[PDB]
Amino acid sequence: GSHMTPKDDEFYQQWQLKYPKLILREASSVSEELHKEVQEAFLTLHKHGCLFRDLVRIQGKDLLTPVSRILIGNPGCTYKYLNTRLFTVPWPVKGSNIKHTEAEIAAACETFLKLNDYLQIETIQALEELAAKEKADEVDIKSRAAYNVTLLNFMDPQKMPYLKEEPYFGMGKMAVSWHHDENLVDRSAVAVYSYSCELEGRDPDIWHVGFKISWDIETPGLAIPLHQGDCYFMLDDLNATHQHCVLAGSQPRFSSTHRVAECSTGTLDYILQRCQLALQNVCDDVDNDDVSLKSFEPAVLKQGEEIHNEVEFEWLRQFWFQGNRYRKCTDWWCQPMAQLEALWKKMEGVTNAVLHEVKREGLPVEQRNEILTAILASLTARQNLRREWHARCQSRIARTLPADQKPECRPYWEKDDASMPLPFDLTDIVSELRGQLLEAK
Ligand SMILES: O=C(O)CNC(=O)c1nc(-c2cccc3ccccc23)ccc1O
Numbered sequence: 001g002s003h004m005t006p007k008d009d010e011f012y013q014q015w016q017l018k019y020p021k022l023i024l025r026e027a028s029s030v031s032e033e034l035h036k037e038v039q040e041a042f043l044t045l046h047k048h049g050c051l052f053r054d055l056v057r058i059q060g061k062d063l064l065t066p067v068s069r070i071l072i073g074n075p076g077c078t079y080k081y082l083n084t085r086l087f088t089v090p091w092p093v094k095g096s097n098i099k100h101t102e103a104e105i106a107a108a109c110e111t112f113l114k115l116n117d118y119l120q121i122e123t124i125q126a127l128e129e130l131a132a133k134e135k136a137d138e139v140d141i142k143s144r145a146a147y148n149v150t151l152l153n154f155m156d157p158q159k160m161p162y163l164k165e166e167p168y169f170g171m172g173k174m175a176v177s178w179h180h181d182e183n184l185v186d187r188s189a190v191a192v193y194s195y196s197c198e199l200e201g202r203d204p205d206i207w208h209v210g211f212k213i214s215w216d217i218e219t220p221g222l223a224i225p226l227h228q229g230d231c232y233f234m235l236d237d238l239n240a241t242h243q244h245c246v247l248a249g250s251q252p253r254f255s256s257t258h259r260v261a262e263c264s265t266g267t268l269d270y271i272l273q274r275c276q277l278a279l280q281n282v283c284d285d286v287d288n289d290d291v292s293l294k295s296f297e298p299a300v301l302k303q304g305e306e307i308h309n310e311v312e313f314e315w316l317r318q319f320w321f322q323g324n325r326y327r328k329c330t331d332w333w334c335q336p337m338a339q340l341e342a343l344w345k346k347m348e349g350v351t352n353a354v355l356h357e358v359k360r361e362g363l364p365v366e367q368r369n370e371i372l373t374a375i376l377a378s379l380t381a382r383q384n385l386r387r388e389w390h391a392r393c394q395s396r397i398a399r400t401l402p403a404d405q406k407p408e409c410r411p412y413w414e415k416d417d418a419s420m421p422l423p424f425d426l427t428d429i430v431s432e433l434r435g436q437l438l439e440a441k
Pocket residue numbers: 081082151152153176177179180181182192194209244245246255257
């Protein structure tokens with residue numbers, strides 16, 4: 001089990017033969033102005049403390065990433081990985097009015113937008129070249145380079161020295177283990193700008209990106225040295241056929257990883273449209289607590305309860321688990337989250353209305369049982385997911401974080417709370433409904 005670096009004769013040919021959708025643009029091909037702007041933007045976002053270690057979940061374990069991160073991108077866009085939905089700090093894309101940041105921060109976002117445009121152009125060029133090599137559509141290519149977000153990383157290996165050893169090729173210390181990037185548009189490229197501050201095998205003191213073939217530890221892995229401002233590109237199916245990792249050096253290092261996030265169910269607009277659809281079933285002359293529904297058709301109720309779950313667990317809890325970090329950097333999401341929370345509270349109202357109907361004196365049991373069968377999976381999931389999020393929020397690792405990042409379990413209410421129609425813990429309700437469904441016939 002071994003690896004190759006530029007110091008190996010076989011390196012270049014092995015790069016050609018087993019890893020040709022991996023492209024490398026050395027810092028030289030990038031303008032000094034852009035380097036400067038980008039690097040000052042990294043340092044800027046670092047000074048203002050905008051990068052946070054994520055509290056992710058892997059194989060059922062709550063883990064703090066060694067790396068500090070922040071997501072920057074199109075307004076209203078999210079990127080979900082390791083069960084953790086990141087919300088963009090917005091950059092000023094076309095027809096945008098952010099009005100949300102502290103001067104320097106905004107300028108940094110603008111910069112990473114500029115970086116994004118450049119890397120996009122380079123990715124398009126390289127993908128052209130690749131298709132032309134293949135020769136020996138255009139919309140597809142522009143589509144696979146349309147980076148809508150960048151995920152920024154920082155790590156100081158001197159302050160963060162608790163790093164695993166690369167287990168298969170002897171590549172040494174890993175900042176990030178072997179993985180595929182999730183939640184990307186199919187066959188979409190990833191473009192990385194790497195900014196490192198200042199013998200057998202790979203140089204331990206220099207940062208590398210490592211690549212291997214999926215399922216395969218026989219084919220030697222590649223360890224690519226990254227210096228200051230080097231760029232690399234994972235093109236086409238590389239991210240699917242291969243795995244990559246980050247090999248830490250000794251100095252601090254920043255990176256900007258530009259992605260086409262698969263946000264078809266990952267944007268504010270999308271989840272507001274979903275909420276609007278759920279509340280089509282609600283009589284909406286006035287906003288009060290007397291929620292009354294237009295139909296108890298099972299399909300409509302199932303849909304409603306499914307959307308309720310989606311806005312609660314994919315949006316509100318995800319957002320508040322992060323402890324309102326990035327309020328530091330922008331207030332963009334404050335109103336939208338308030339709005340999604342109000343919509344969700346109304347849906348608590350809807351559920352209550354269904355539970356009210358299910359108990360109604362003159363409701364024929366057949367219709368009742370149709371309703372129960374329609375909503376039960378949703379309520380069961382709501383209960384299990386609430387147990388999970390509550391536990392995730394209270395975990396030992398979670399309580400150790402600063403007060404500026406303390407996982408707020410939200411929304412959360414006590415039974416003594418008369419403002420909420422339904423209890424947080426639905427155990428008894430789900431029991432009753434199941435009991436009802438199995439009554440003698
Ligand atoms: O810095 C580099 O040169 C390489 N960056 C990443 O690979 C990277 N990968 C992920 C990532 C995305 C999706 C799923 C993952 C699963 C495990 C580890 C990283 C993952 C996140 C931030 C990153 O910076």
